[PDB]
Amino acid sequence: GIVEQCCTSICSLYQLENYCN
Amino acid sequence: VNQHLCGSHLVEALYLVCGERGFFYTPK
Ligand SMILES: [Cl-]
Ligand SMILES: [Zn+2]
């Protein structure tokens, strides 16, 4: 998930917007 | 790579990025 994707490697604001509601 | 320490940074960044739309945080 986002832990998998954003903790090993740095997610941008762009990538993180994907998890919004 | 501590998901727990990392997780708390992520919930804070999702609060800024998502703002008003909100989000679900399932640690999943
Ligand atoms: Cl930390
Ligand atoms: Zn920290």
Side-chain angles (χ1 to χ4, degrees):
Chain A
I2 184 180
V3 161
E4 210 221 320
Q5 162 168 324
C6 300
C7 291
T8 102
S9 315
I10 297 135
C11 295
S12 77
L13 178 167
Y14 300 113
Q15 271 151 314
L16 288 163
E17 221 164 33
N18 310 332
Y19 308 105
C20 304
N21 255 181
Chain B
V1 46
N2 189 337
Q3 78 130 228
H4 186 58
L5 290 203
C6 178
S8 101
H9 285 290
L10 295 177
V11 298
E12 197 159 320
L14 285 184
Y15 155 88
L16 297 154
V17 168
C18 305
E20 336 288 312
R21 267 140 92 201
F23 62 102
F24 283 69
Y25 183 92
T26 354
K28 222 102 191 133

